Amino acid sequence: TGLLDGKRILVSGIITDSSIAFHIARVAQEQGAQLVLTGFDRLRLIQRITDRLPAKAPLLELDVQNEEHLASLAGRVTEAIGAGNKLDGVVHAIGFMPQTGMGINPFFDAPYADVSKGIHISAYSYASMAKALLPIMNPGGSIVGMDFDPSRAMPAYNWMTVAKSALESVNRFVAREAGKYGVRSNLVAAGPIRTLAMSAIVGGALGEEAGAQIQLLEEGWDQRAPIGWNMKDATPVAKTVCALLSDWLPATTGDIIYADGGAHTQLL
Amino acid sequence: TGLLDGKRILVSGIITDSSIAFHIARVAQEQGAQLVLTGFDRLRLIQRITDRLPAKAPLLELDVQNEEHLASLAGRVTEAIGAGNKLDGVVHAIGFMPQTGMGINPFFDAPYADVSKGIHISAYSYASMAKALLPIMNPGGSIVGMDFDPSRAMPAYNWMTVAKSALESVNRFVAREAGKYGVRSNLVAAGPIRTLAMSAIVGGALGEEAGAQIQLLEEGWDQRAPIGWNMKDATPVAKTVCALLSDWLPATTGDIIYADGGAHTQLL
Amino acid sequence: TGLLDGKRILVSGIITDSSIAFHIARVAQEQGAQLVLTGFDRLRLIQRITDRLPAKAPLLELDVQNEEHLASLAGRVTEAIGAGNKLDGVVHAIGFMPQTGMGINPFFDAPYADVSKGIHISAYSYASMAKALLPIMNPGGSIVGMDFDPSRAMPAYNWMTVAKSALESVNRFVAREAGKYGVRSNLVAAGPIRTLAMSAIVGGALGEEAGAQIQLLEEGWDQRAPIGWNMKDATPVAKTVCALLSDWLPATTGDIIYADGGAHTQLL
Amino acid sequence: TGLLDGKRILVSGIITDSSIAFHIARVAQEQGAQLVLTGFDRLRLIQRITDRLPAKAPLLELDVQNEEHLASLAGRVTEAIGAGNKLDGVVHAIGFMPQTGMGINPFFDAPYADVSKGIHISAYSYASMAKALLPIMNPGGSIVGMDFDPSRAMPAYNWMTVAKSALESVNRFVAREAGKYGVRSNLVAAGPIRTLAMSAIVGGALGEEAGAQIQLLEEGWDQRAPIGWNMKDATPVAKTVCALLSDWLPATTGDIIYADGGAHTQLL
Numbered sequence A, B, C, D: 001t002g003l004l005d006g007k008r009i010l011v012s013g014i015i016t017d018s019s020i021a022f023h024i025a026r027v028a029q030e031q032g033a034q035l036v037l038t039g040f041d042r043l044r045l046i047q048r049i050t051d052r053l054p055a056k057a058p059l060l061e062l063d064v065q066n067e068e069h070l071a072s073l074a075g076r077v078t079e080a081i082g083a084g085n086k087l088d089g090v091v092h093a094i095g096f097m098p099q100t101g102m103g104i105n106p107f108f109d110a111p112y113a114d115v116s117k118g119i120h121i122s123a124y125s126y127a128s129m130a131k132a133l134l135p136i137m138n139p140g141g142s143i144v145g146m147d148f149d150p151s152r153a154m155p156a157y158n159w160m161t162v163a164k165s166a167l168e169s170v171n172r173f174v175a176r177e178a179g180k181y182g183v184r185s186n187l188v189a190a191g192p193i194r195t196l197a198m199s200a201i202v203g204g205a206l207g208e209e210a211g212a213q214i215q216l217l218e219e220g221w222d223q224r225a226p227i228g229w230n231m232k233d234a235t236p237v238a239k240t241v242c243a244l245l246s247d248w249l250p251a252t253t254g255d256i257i258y259a260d261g262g263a264h265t266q267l268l
């Protein structure tokens, strides 16, 4: 086709039609991929959201903190894709940090229970998904997670940044595992995307200073980006994930591709 | 004196006389610092170990996973150092990863409960200690944590590497907090040191392949290091921590100083 | 088509049929691109080499140290591609370092005249080519240079590594310029490829220790690479350049994509 | 004493009393070091400037582009420090980029002759000085160069940033050489310092947009720096160089210490 013609790809992390995973899924479908989707807690909602995708995809429940969901995932996917068949692609687009780890709520006041939850979902689950899914991936396969660059501290994202640092680190280790399968594991570091949760935050859900910082981060991003950054458009990030899902970056693993407008390559 | 003449410095993480913190404490004492030590669970043992230090230091209990130890730490330190007095320096030299996160035990088989424990102790506690201690630190003060470079995946260290990635990320955030106090926060990335736990590992405590990898990592380190690396000597790392504790790196925060022989600057 | 269907792409740096640029050109042609090739000094040779490409491409002379070649390049390319037409893609695959900057010839003994020549060709020419070609590139266009990771020093590559460090730095600046055109500028950091010059070096052209180091670097690469590294195969690198030439990494500029088997993400 | 008590240290790069090298020299003298200074072209001027140093230091001429100055340097230094004696420390604080490589003068318009000059002086000379001086350095010795972080492109500094990227790369290679002598080689990445040339630039010497960018870079620096950044104060950078010159960072080579207020650890 079709960048992804005839690849079977699992895509997690659709929750709204503004989810980065929603766009990745749409772009993957436009590109010939046959999807299986996961979806966390509100599966009726996600089913309804994902009905709007160019094509039908079976939707499986996966709460990444649920050991049983992870244990059964894979059997459930091979059931969805047919017993002879394996996955070519896996998209991790899962993230969460309790808002204590995120606010104008001081960095220091996030209880470990909360940061731990955040890291479980946002970092450890990348290894979890890979563990569940590598047994049902084809050689030449590709696992992609969603990242943002946590190299430098920043306002507001707080423990979520730490979670991303941990994720990038996890990604290099899953690369080692994925490699024994002929599978690549990479992260896409996106710039900020006005996802519903993000709009809620710039809109003041987590306090005014958190919103103000974030708005500041967004403007600076587009300014630093040599090709600009449009936070209202997930598609350049969806496409980048698809590029990683494709056979066109075959020698790249344990790695991070920056779909951020080049902002991170630029101080000012 | 005395690099650290008249600085009050808290040093955590002494457990044996081969602890990096033991050397840091010794070097800090030789350098004029007045120490308060923390010590986790075996305080009789640590007291006996620390008796061998050039000078007396009060030893306080601090289990970094214990909220109450953290809540009372600070009052306990100002009690140890005298009500008029604040800390100039804090050494975090705390690390742990349950051995499921460390073995030939596959990376994928570490339960999150265990990696979470590891991250609590090895990463989050850096923010914990800083939160507890910044209220009782002087402007010009310095928080230093022990790191190793988690930029690239490696054999055996597994989730502990992820924990370090998370720590480095935490360190940049505590820098932001520490800065409001005039306090620096930095990490020292050491090369491998034949600490008791490390010797136990190269000796096969965590399986033979884990020991073999680790021994390999050690030899390659000294080979890559343009000035060599002696894993039996913590003192160049103790000295580096002291350099960070001193006023001689006054414009360095949120940062990592590599006391690793320059190995990380060298591919081969 | 065709990852690159209907893109006009200039590809420099073909000198043998084992040139990375040769493979990039072949892969680009297989992918629907219409090429213009440049070629430095031995144009009869290059023409004969490039005859073996899936398709015809006009071959233009470009000595990147020749101001006049650069001044006329662009007019010559629009002549080759037709007056209405612009470039969508530019491949810099040019490198050279006089062997004084490369040997067992001590790092210190390379005269500046030689390292300067190397940097002119290997780094500065990336800005040169971009300067010449950006006026005749389409929005959505892509400039790609060939890199190897110079983050850490290494044996044998010496001043060539410095040249790559300078190149990566140049690349971030050309990104800033390229961006005003809607053009991306990125580098591909390849692992070692047994190009004729490289085989000559491991074979002892530059002394035995240089060959031995290099062979060592190669073996370690494939070992560190979670998906392996085949130094006899440029195609995963050709494909990665094509991925950058494509519209599939639209939010990536000033950046470096590692087509190296993930080796750089791995210490050991 | 005296961080640097009884160390013989060569310090290059004094040109005004606002030179970073001037402060390094002053701080080194306050710290017990016995200096030899180099000085490029205006030696009467430099002698007069350096008379203001806490102590006398012999001033030697060293034009780093002059092969003969480099060939004779070392004999001239051992003459200045006495035949039995070697250097413990070498400070490279040399930089220059012709203003074509620096302006609102487009990045693309800097002729290679000029960038080459800049790199000769700003990067290659680090290897030059090390080559000249390592034969007359003691084991445990320390070479330190002045850097600024060229990881990300920035406005105005243009080719000078490329020069720094090349310098950092050179530094890792001189580490390899320096190591055979027991000598460390490290760079200090300073934040912006209102040196005479820098004030001239923010004041509009190189065009208004270059000044405006630079002023912007300065303000953002102090904002990002968790401990702030005072561009009018070189002393935290002088002290950091001294820390590297000292025995207190004995396991750090091929490395870069950021004396920048922690700004580089912080996105915003």
Ligand SMILES: NC(=O)c1c[n+]([C@@H]2O[C@H](COP(=O)([O-])OP(=O)(O)OC[C@H]3O[C@@H](n4cnc5c(N)ncnc54)[C@H](O)[C@@H]3O)[C@@H](O)[C@H]2O)ccc1C(=O)c1ccncc1
Pocket: A012, A013, A014, A015, A016, A018, A019, A020, A021, A039, A040, A041, A062, A063, A064, A065, A092, A093, A094, A095, A096, A121, A146, A147, A148, A149, A157, A189, A190, A191, A192, A193, A194, A195, A197, A198
């Ligand atoms: N701006 C952004 O939206 C942004 C998003 N991402 C990543 O993109 C991925 C998708 O996020 P999104 O589309 O923004 O947000 P979303 O809320 O649409 O998706 C998050 C998904 O995670 C799912 N999830 C939460 N908990 C669980 C669980 N227990 N089990 C299974 N699934 C669960 C949830 O159902 C939802 O579908 C996440 O990893 C993000 O962190 C990465 C980077 C950025 C961008 O944050 C950014 C750029 C620069 N600095 C900071 C941030």
Ligand SMILES: NC(=O)c1c[n+]([C@@H]2O[C@H](COP(=O)([O-])OP(=O)(O)OC[C@H]3O[C@@H](n4cnc5c(N)ncnc54)[C@H](O)[C@@H]3O)[C@@H](O)[C@H]2O)ccc1C(=O)c1ccncc1
Pocket: B012, B013, B014, B015, B016, B018, B019, B020, B021, B039, B040, B041, B062, B063, B064, B065, B092, B093, B094, B095, B096, B121, B146, B147, B148, B149, B157, B189, B190, B191, B192, B193, B194, B195, B197, B198
């Ligand atoms: N080789 C090493 O020994 C090494 C050690 N460090 C760090 O140095 C620090 C000190 O470790 P060490 O001296 O090796 O080991 P240690 O066992 O002497 O000290 C660890 C300390 O942590 C303490 N601790 C554990 N749990 C708790 C708790 N709940 N509350 C309070 N304290 C607790 C424990 O009591 C002990 O004192 C740790 O952060 C290490 O991770 C950092 C890097 C390296 C080196 O690992 C390295 C280099 C390159 N690649 C991998 C590793």
Ligand SMILES: NC(=O)c1c[n+]([C@@H]2O[C@H](COP(=O)([O-])OP(=O)(O)OC[C@H]3O[C@@H](n4cnc5c(N)ncnc54)[C@H](O)[C@@H]3O)[C@@H](O)[C@H]2O)ccc1C(=O)c1ccncc1
Pocket: C012, C013, C014, C015, C016, C018, C019, C020, C021, C039, C040, C041, C062, C063, C064, C065, C092, C093, C094, C095, C096, C121, C146, C147, C148, C149, C157, C189, C190, C191, C192, C193, C194, C195, C197, C198
């Ligand atoms: N192994 C490799 O072959 C390798 C090659 N590259 C880059 O790939 C690009 C193509 O190199 P190649 O295919 O290996 O070698 P090649 O000799 O086939 O191509 C070099 C080209 O540069 C051209 N050239 C030289 N001087 C001029 C000039 N004045 N004007 C115009 N053109 C000129 C020359 O004609 C030739 O076509 C160069 O930038 C390389 O540096 C990048 C990385 C690696 C790999 O070096 C690597 C990986 C890890 N560590 C070290 C090295």
Ligand SMILES: NC(=O)c1c[n+]([C@@H]2O[C@H](COP(=O)([O-])OP(=O)(O)OC[C@H]3O[C@@H](n4cnc5c(N)ncnc54)[C@H](O)[C@@H]3O)[C@@H](O)[C@H]2O)ccc1C(=O)c1ccncc1
Pocket: D012, D013, D014, D015, D016, D018, D019, D020, D021, D039, D040, D041, D062, D063, D064, D065, D092, D093, D094, D095, D096, D121, D146, D147, D148, D149, D157, D189, D190, D191, D192, D193, D194, D195, D197, D198
């Ligand atoms: N702001 C700054 O002043 C700054 C300065 N440095 C480095 O500090 C070092 C000293 O520079 P300075 O004190 O700013 O400037 P300066 O003009 O006082 O010193 C430069 C010295 O180089 C000497 N020099 C020039 N040509 C030659 C030659 N052929 N042979 C021998 N010596 C020669 C010259 O005599 C002068 O003494 C240089 O390497 C700088 O690049 C490094 C970083 C920064 C800072 O630029 C910075 C921070 C963030 N982004 C960008 C810049």
